[PDB]
Design a protein around this motif. Structure first.
Motif, mmCIF file in Angstrom:
data_model
loop_
_atom_site.group_PDB
_atom_site.id
_atom_site.type_symbol
_atom_site.label_atom_id
_atom_site.label_comp_id
_atom_site.label_asym_id
_atom_site.label_seq_id
_atom_site.Cartn_x
_atom_site.Cartn_y
_atom_site.Cartn_z
ATOM 1 N N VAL A 98 0.844 -1.188 0.000
ATOM 2 C CA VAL A 98 0.000 0.000 0.000
ATOM 3 C C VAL A 98 0.881 1.240 0.000
ATOM 4 O O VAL A 98 1.984 1.251 0.560
ATOM 5 C CB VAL A 98 -0.969 -0.010 1.200
ATOM 6 N N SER A 99 0.395 2.295 -0.651
ATOM 7 C CA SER A 99 1.127 3.558 -0.723
ATOM 8 C C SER A 99 0.088 4.674 -0.725
ATOM 9 O O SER A 99 -0.470 5.004 -1.774
ATOM 10 C CB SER A 99 2.017 3.612 -1.955
ATOM 11 N N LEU A 100 -0.154 5.251 0.446
ATOM 12 C CA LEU A 100 -1.276 6.155 0.632
ATOM 13 C C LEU A 100 -0.981 7.533 0.053
ATOM 14 O O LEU A 100 0.168 7.980 0.004
ATOM 15 C CB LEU A 100 -1.627 6.288 2.118
ATOM 16 N N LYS A 101 -2.035 8.191 -0.419
ATOM 17 C CA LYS A 101 -1.955 9.615 -0.697
ATOM 18 C C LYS A 101 -1.994 10.392 0.609
ATOM 19 O O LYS A 101 -2.530 9.927 1.617
ATOM 20 C CB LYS A 101 -3.103 10.068 -1.593
ATOM 21 N N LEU A 102 -1.425 11.588 0.588
ATOM 22 C CA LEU A 102 -1.407 12.425 1.773
ATOM 23 C C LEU A 102 -2.704 13.240 1.776
ATOM 24 O O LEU A 102 -3.593 13.021 0.950
ATOM 25 C CB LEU A 102 -0.117 13.248 1.783
ATOM 26 N N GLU A 103 -2.839 14.183 2.708
ATOM 27 C CA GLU A 103 -4.124 14.847 2.914
ATOM 28 C C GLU A 103 -4.423 15.858 1.811
ATOM 29 O O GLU A 103 -5.529 15.877 1.259
ATOM 30 C CB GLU A 103 -4.139 15.517 4.286
ATOM 31 N N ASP A 104 -3.446 16.697 1.464
ATOM 32 C CA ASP A 104 -3.672 17.757 0.487
ATOM 33 C C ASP A 104 -3.703 17.263 -0.956
ATOM 34 O O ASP A 104 -4.111 18.024 -1.840
ATOM 35 C CB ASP A 104 -2.608 18.852 0.647
ATOM 36 N N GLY A 105 -3.294 16.025 -1.216
ATOM 37 C CA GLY A 105 -3.335 15.492 -2.564
ATOM 38 C C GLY A 105 -1.975 15.293 -3.199
ATOM 39 O O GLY A 105 -1.811 15.490 -4.407
ATOM 40 N N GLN A 131 1.663 12.572 -3.125
ATOM 41 C CA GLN A 131 2.070 11.218 -2.786
ATOM 42 C C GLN A 131 2.970 11.208 -1.556
ATOM 43 O O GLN A 131 3.728 12.146 -1.302
ATOM 44 C CB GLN A 131 2.790 10.565 -3.962
ATOM 45 N N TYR A 132 2.871 10.128 -0.783
ATOM 46 C CA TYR A 132 3.711 9.856 0.377
ATOM 47 C C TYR A 132 4.904 8.998 -0.046
ATOM 48 O O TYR A 132 4.733 8.033 -0.797
ATOM 49 C CB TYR A 132 2.909 9.144 1.462
ATOM 50 N N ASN A 190 10.214 10.618 10.796
ATOM 51 C CA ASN A 190 9.819 11.888 11.381
ATOM 52 C C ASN A 190 8.300 12.010 11.384
ATOM 53 O O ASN A 190 7.585 11.219 10.765
ATOM 54 C CB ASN A 190 10.479 13.059 10.640
ATOM 55 N N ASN A 191 7.808 13.023 12.097
ATOM 56 C CA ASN A 191 6.371 13.222 12.278
ATOM 57 C C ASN A 191 5.802 13.841 11.003
ATOM 58 O O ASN A 191 5.532 15.041 10.918
ATOM 59 C CB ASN A 191 6.107 14.101 13.492
ATOM 60 N N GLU A 192 5.618 12.997 9.987
ATOM 61 C CA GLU A 192 5.172 13.489 8.690
ATOM 62 C C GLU A 192 3.662 13.366 8.525
ATOM 63 O O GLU A 192 2.990 14.356 8.222
ATOM 64 C CB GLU A 192 5.883 12.734 7.565
ATOM 65 N N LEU A 193 3.111 12.171 8.718
ATOM 66 C CA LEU A 193 1.669 11.994 8.820
ATOM 67 C C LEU A 193 1.341 11.550 10.238
ATOM 68 O O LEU A 193 1.938 10.599 10.753
ATOM 69 C CB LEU A 193 1.132 11.005 7.777
ATOM 70 N N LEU A 194 0.420 12.256 10.865
ATOM 71 C CA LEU A 194 0.020 12.136 12.252
ATOM 72 C C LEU A 194 -1.408 11.593 12.356
ATOM 73 O O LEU A 194 -2.209 11.803 11.441
ATOM 74 C CB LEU A 194 0.163 13.512 12.918
ATOM 75 N N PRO A 195 -1.756 10.878 13.434
ATOM 76 C CA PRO A 195 -3.018 10.120 13.435
ATOM 77 C C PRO A 195 -4.247 11.007 13.574
ATOM 78 O O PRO A 195 -4.321 11.863 14.458
ATOM 79 C CB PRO A 195 -2.867 9.184 14.639
ATOM 80 N N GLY A 196 -5.218 10.783 12.690
ATOM 81 C CA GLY A 196 -6.488 11.477 12.751
ATOM 82 C C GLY A 196 -6.982 11.999 11.417
ATOM 83 O O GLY A 196 -8.194 12.105 11.205
ATOM 84 N N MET A 197 -6.063 12.329 10.513
ATOM 85 C CA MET A 197 -6.410 13.021 9.280
ATOM 86 C C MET A 197 -7.088 12.076 8.290
ATOM 87 O O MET A 197 -7.188 10.866 8.506
ATOM 88 C CB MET A 197 -5.170 13.653 8.655
ATOM 89 N N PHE A 198 -7.554 12.642 7.180
ATOM 90 C CA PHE A 198 -8.292 11.908 6.161
ATOM 91 C C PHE A 198 -7.366 11.650 4.978
ATOM 92 O O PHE A 198 -6.929 12.596 4.314
ATOM 93 C CB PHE A 198 -9.524 12.700 5.725
ATOM 94 N N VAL A 199 -7.067 10.378 4.716
ATOM 95 C CA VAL A 199 -6.105 9.993 3.692
ATOM 96 C C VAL A 199 -6.781 9.073 2.681
ATOM 97 O O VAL A 199 -7.914 8.631 2.862
ATOM 98 C CB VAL A 199 -4.865 9.307 4.288
ATOM 99 N N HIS A 200 -6.049 8.780 1.607
ATOM 100 C CA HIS A 200 -6.507 7.901 0.536
ATOM 101 C C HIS A 200 -5.411 6.894 0.237
ATOM 102 O O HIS A 200 -4.318 7.279 -0.187
ATOM 103 C CB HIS A 200 -6.838 8.697 -0.729
ATOM 104 N N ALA A 201 -5.696 5.613 0.443
ATOM 105 C CA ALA A 201 -4.712 4.585 0.150
ATOM 106 C C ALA A 201 -4.851 4.093 -1.288
ATOM 107 O O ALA A 201 -5.796 4.428 -2.005
ATOM 108 C CB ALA A 201 -4.838 3.421 1.128
#
Lengths: 104, 155, 52
Positions: free
Chosen positions: C1-8, C10-11, C41-52
């Motif tokens: 899996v390789s999720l998209k980040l919140e703003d759109g 790639q991670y 590092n603290n790049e993606l933090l728990p709670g936000m809305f992501v797209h895998a």
């Protein structure tokens, strides 16, 4: 709550002092348990010193050793609560904000 | 002068200290009633008054004893703007240096500036799932009760 | 899996999939899938809305 003993935002260790809940009735139980232990321990040590030449019975020593281990288990169960009123971080990581300040 | 035994003294000393523990628990139970203020500061109104029955650890409070000579200011920021800011600060386009990364200098609801300046505390590590925002609290001193806890301010 | 980040965007790191949960939701009728991702590092933090 008496004292907050950390700073928010900084990462905590495993088993770090965080709060201090008022040990009014959780230290007086520990002094009572330690007071019972300070007599039952002397009873068990004296009967252990006496059974080596069979002054007292081999059953009265078993009764005294049972009373000693029950009193030690009572001391340990009463210091578990004294450790519970020192509330510790169960994990290690970033800590958020204190939703309950000191005094509440 | 050895008239009674040493074990017969030890169990009596144990009973004496257990009874001191019972007196200490009874007097802290008598100090729970006649309730002492656990904190210094400005007290509010009385939620219960003369004659209202209370119970051990009830739901509603009785008096909110606040002190506010420093204050906390929870400040929200949406996660998309903080993500864009972390992107453009990890890039070489922008830098954050100097001593001015901790000043805030908030302003009130009507546009009036606040004369003192504060210090920026930690940032919260997790967003809220109902609003998508971190909280970044700060510390501000007010020497003469300039602002009340619970207002709306702009950091 | 390789999720998209919140703003759109790639991670950079790719993650491991696990835990195909068997219990279908009542009203939505959608099973839940639990990926896992490492971050140094603290790049993606728990709670936000992501797209895998």
């Amino acid at each position: 709550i008496l004292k907050r003993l950390f700073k928010e935002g900084s990462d905590v260790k495993a088993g770090q002092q965080l709060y201090q809940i008022d040990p009014a009735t959780y230290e007086a139980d520990y002094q009572s348990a330690q007071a019972n232990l300070a007599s039952t321990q002397e009873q068990a040590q004296r009967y252990k010193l006496l059974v080596a030449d069979q002054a007292v019975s081999k059953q009265q020593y078993a009764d005294a050793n049972a009373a000693y281990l029950q009193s030690k288990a009572a001391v340990e169960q009463a210091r578990i609560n004294l450790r519970y009123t020192k509330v510790l971080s169960p994990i290690s990581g970033r800590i958020g904000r204190s939703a309950v300040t000191e005094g509440a | 002068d050895q008239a009674v035994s040493k074990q017969q003294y030890a169990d009596a000393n144990a009973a004496y200290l257990q009874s001191k523990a019972a007196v200490e628990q009874a007097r802290i139970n008598l100090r729970y009633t006649k309730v002492l203020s656990p904190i210094s500061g400005r007290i509010g109104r009385s939620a219960v008054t003369e004659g209202a029955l209370v119970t051990n650890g009830q739901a509603n409070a009785m008096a909110t004893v606040q002190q506010l000579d420093p204050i906390y200011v929870d400040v929200t920021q949406p996660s998309t703007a903080l993500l864009r800011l972390r992107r453009e600060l990890a890039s070489g386009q922008l830098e954050r240096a100097g001593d001015n990364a901790a000043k805030v200098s908030l302003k009130l609801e009507d546009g009036s500036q606040y004369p003192l300046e504060g210090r920026l505390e930690f940032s919260e590590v997790s967003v809220d799932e109902g609003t998508g925002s971190v909280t970044i609290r700060a510390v501000f001193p007010n020497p003469n009760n300039e602002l009340l806890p619970g207002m709306f301010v702009h950091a």
